[PDB]
């Protein structure tokens, strides 16, 4: 027996069922592109179960006793085991709708709704978007300008270099302020699509006005290609950095998030992911414990109270869950 909720079981970075999970995740992604959110979650959950298994699935008999494995996900796995390929998955892969929605949604600042609108309007390629600049936000224009670099996996070596410049800028702007790497890299991932940093200071309020200072410093070093600062709920800067490399440079997406230290454990938990892990953790919190969890806090709607947490461990404990380090949150 394996627990139902992804937040009740360790999911490591590397596993034994990558072919099967990849296929189910194609179907999940395609469902999301069609606005079929239930079906997305269902396929995502099934793929997550395979990631938590200790052995490869070689025969269909191994599916027995697993949660979140309905008829459809089972058929997909069955066809892959018996025939090496799943016709439904291959049809999705080859479909113009899926290919175009994947193309568009990958671009910085483009979500499903925008990509679907563009599809419906007859846009198909990146050049089509460039021919219609009035249809694009500034953020999307920047994503198109740098699209090749932004669809090149970000590497741990890139992350280490970026963390150094961000730490230097933060330290120079405000001694005592800290930078914490979050997102998939904190979970042990070797690559990613962006780099996520959470900034705070141990004295509540000393973080005020820090981010614009940090950004000024980075911009003056030539390290910023694009920056969008927003006060709202955490203060954040959505950026594209110009990462110098030997004889070259590459654009890399970086999100900088400032949280007041009182909210830091909630922010770190939220921003560390995985996306499915946090969805599951919030569902667990609400359904099993009656508490509402988000990136700012843990609220009891009956008592109208907020839980004081010093750490992620505090939050897990309060929810009655065994602690999972970030590298076991790869749901
Ligand atoms: N839709 C969402 N639901 C819940 N949490 C989310 C969602 N989107 C983002 N988050 C949280 C969890 C993520 O780990 C974190 C950073 O997002 P993001 O950088 O897109 O993912 P990631 O860093 O884990 O993977 P990647 O390797 O693609 O960067 O923010
Ligand atoms: Mg990330």
UniProtKB/Swiss-Prot annotation:
Query: Which Enzyme Commission number(s) are on file for it?
Result: 2.7.7.7
Cofactor(s) for this UniProt protein: Mg(2+)
Residues involved in Mg(2+) binding:
194, 196, 255
GO terms under biological process? B cell differentiation; DNA recombination; double-strand break repair via nonhomologous end joining; somatic hypermutation of immunoglobulin genes
Molecular function via GO: DNA binding; DNA-directed DNA polymerase activity; metal ion binding
- Transmembrane domains' residue ranges: none
Protein's cellular compartments: Nucleus
Q: Which reaction does it catalyse?
A: DNA(n) + a 2'-deoxyribonucleoside 5'-triphosphate = DNA(n+1) + diphosphate
Marked site positions, Responsible for the low discrimination between dNTP and rNTP: 270
Tissue specificity here reads: Expressed in a number of tissues. Abundant in thymus.
Q: Does Translocase appear among the keywords? A: no
Involved in ssDNA binding, as annotated region: 187-196
Q: Per UniProt, which keywords does this protein have?
A: DNA damage, DNA recombination, DNA repair, DNA-directed DNA polymerase, Magnesium, Metal-binding, Nucleotidyltransferase, Nucleus, Phosphoprotein, Transferase
GO CC, sorted alphabetically, is:
nucleoplasm; nucleus
Family (UniProt): Belongs to the DNA polymerase type-X family.
Reproduce the miscellaneous comment text: DPOLM has a reduced ability to distinguish dNTP and rNTP as substrates, and elongates them on DNA primer strand with a similar efficiency. It is able to polymerize nucleotides on RNA primer strands.
Physiological role:
Gap-filling polymerase involved in repair of DNA double-strand breaks by non-homologous end joining (NHEJ). Participates in immunoglobulin (Ig) light chain gene rearrangement in V(D)J recombination.
The protein's name is DNA-directed DNA/RNA polymerase mu
Biological source species = Homo sapiens
**Lineage start:** Eukaryota, Metazoa, Chordata, Craniata, Vertebrata
Query: Per UniProt, what is the name of the gene that codes for the protein in this document?
Result: POLM
